[PDB]
Amino acid sequence: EYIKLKVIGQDSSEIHFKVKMTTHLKKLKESYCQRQGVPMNSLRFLFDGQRIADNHTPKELGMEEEDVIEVYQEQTG
C-alpha cells in the first residue's frame, strides 16, 4: 500500500516520505521543492541513476521500502 522513501540531496540530509505505491512521483517532487524552497524545475531526481519522470510511480520503478532518491541541482558549462 504505502512505501517509505528517502530523498537525499546536497546537504546529505534525509527527507523521509511515506507515499502510495501507485501515485505519480510528480507530487513527491513538488513536496520536496516546497520543503527546500526552490523551484521544481531546478532539481533533478534520480533513482539508481534513472531520471524520475512526473508520471513514474514507485511500483513502476520497482522501488522498495526505504529506497533512496537522489536530488541534484543544475550543472552548466
Binding site: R44, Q75, G77
Partner: protein
C-alpha cells in the same frame, strides 16, 4: 521532452546545462541501444564522492560489458568534457574541446570498471585497460561551446562517424540538437 528554459541553453552562445546533455545522451542510447550505454552527467560526481558503493545500483539492469562504447560526460568546474570506454580494445579515452588535461578522471573510471568487473563476475575485464587523451580532435575557439563539442563527439562515436566538423559548424550543430530534442529522434 524538456522545458523551454532547458532547451534555451542551446540558443546563441549559452552554456549547455545537464538537461540538454543528459537528454541527448538518452536520445543517442535510444538510437543504438545494443552498442552504447550513456551515463548521465551526475554519475562521475557521485562516483568521486561516494565511490563504487555510491553508483553500484546504476547498473542493476545493464550489462556494461556487452556494450561496445560507454559515454561518460564529465562535469568539471564550469566545463563539459567526455570519457569514452570502448570495450573491444579496452581503451578509456578523455576528450576535451579546450585542451584540458584532467588525469584524475580516467583513473576514476578505470577503478570503477575494475570493481564492476569483479562484482558482476566478468573477470575477463580485470586486465588490459589502457588510457589515451584523444589526439587529433576539433578544438573550440570560444569559451562557450564545451557542451556542444561533447555532444557532437558523442553522436559521432555512437554512429561510428569521423569527426568531420569544426568550430564554424557549431551554431548549426546547436540548432540540430535543438531540433532532435524537440522531435525526440536523432537525424
Amino acid at each position: 521532452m524538456l522545458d523551454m528554459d532547458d532547451l534555451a541553453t542551446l540558443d546563441g552562445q549559452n552554456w549547455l546545462n545537464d538537461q540538454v546533455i543528459n537528454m541527448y545522451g538518452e536520445l543517442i542510447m535510444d538510437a543504438v541501444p545494443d552498442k552504447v550505454h550513456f551515463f548521465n552527467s551526475f554519475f562521475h560526481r557521485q562516483l568521486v564522492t561516494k565511490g563504487y558503493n555510491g553508483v553500484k545500483r546504476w547498473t542493476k539492469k545493464v550489462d556494461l560489458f556487452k556494450k561496445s562504447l560507454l559515454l561518460i560526460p564529465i562535469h568539471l568546474e564550469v566545463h563539459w568534457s567526455l570519457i569514452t570506454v570502448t570495450l573491444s580494445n579496452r581503451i578509456i579515452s578523455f576528450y576535451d574541446s579546450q585542451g584540458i588535461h584532467f588525469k584524475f578522471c580516467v583513473e576514476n573510471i578505470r577503478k570503477y570498471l575494475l570493481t564492476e568487473a569483479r562484482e558482476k563476475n566478468r573477470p575477463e575485464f580485470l586486465q588490459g585497460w589502457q588510457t589515451a587523451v584523444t589526439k587529433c580532435i576539433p578544438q573550440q575557439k570560444n569559451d562557450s561551446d564545451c557542451g556542444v563539442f561533447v555532444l557532437q563527439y558523442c553522436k559521432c562515436l555512437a554512429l561510428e562517424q569521423p569527426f568531420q566538423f569544426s568550430q564554424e559548424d557549431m551554431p548549426r550543430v546547436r540548432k540540430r540538437i535543438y531540433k532532435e530534442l524537440c522531435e525526440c529522434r536523432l537525424m
